[PDB]
């Protein structure tokens, strides 16, 4: 954390634990997908791709927790997720 825990509210520190978890999951997805493209061993590629897609599940579960515990995550995710049409509108 960037600020002393003494001044952070309990909810802020739990959301921090969730946010940094999603960040690490996102990094694993990207790392694994790049290694899937570059790997020259098909058995390794199958393991990497399997783990990659489970990191996406890990991230989705934690993002749902954030949505349920943060009004503005809920509002903004409701606005854009599972839509059609230009996203910037």
Query: What is the binding site for Fe ion (CB under 5 A)?
Result: 25, 55, 58
Tell me which residues in 30-89 interact with its own copies (CB under 8 A). Answer: 30-35, 37-41, 43-44, 46-48, 50-54, 56-65, 67-70, 72-73, 75-83, 86-88
Nearest to 81 by CA among 69, 67, 71: 67
- Is the Cβ of residue 51 or residue 67 nearer to Fe ion in the bound state? 51
Tell me which residues in 7-36 interact with its own copies (CB under 8 A). Answer: 7-35
41 counts as binding Ca ion under rule CB under 5 A: yes
Kindly state the DSSP code that residue 28 receives in the 8-state scheme: H
43 counts as binding Ca ion under rule CB under 5 A: yes
How far apart are alpha carbons 88 and 2 in whole angstroms? 32
In the complex, the smallest distance separating the C-beta of residue 46 from its own copies, rounded to whole angstroms, is: 5
Burial per residue of 8-22, b for 16 or more beta-carbon CB atoms within 10 angstroms, e otherwise: eeeeeeebeebeebb
Kindly state the DSSP code that residue 87 receives in the 8-state scheme: T
């Amino acid at each position: 954390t960037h600020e002393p825990l003494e001044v952070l509210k309990e909810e802020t520190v739990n959301r921090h634990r969730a946010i940094v978890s999603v960040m690490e999951e996102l990094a694993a997805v990207d790392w694994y997908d790049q290694r899937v493209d570059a790997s020259t061993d098909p058995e390794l590629t199958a393991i990497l791709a399997h783990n990659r897609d489970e990191e996406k599940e890990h991230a989705a579960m934690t993002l749902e927790w954030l949505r349920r515990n943060d009004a503005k995550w809920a509002e903004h995710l409701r606005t854009y997720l599972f839509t059609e049409g230009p996203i910037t509108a």
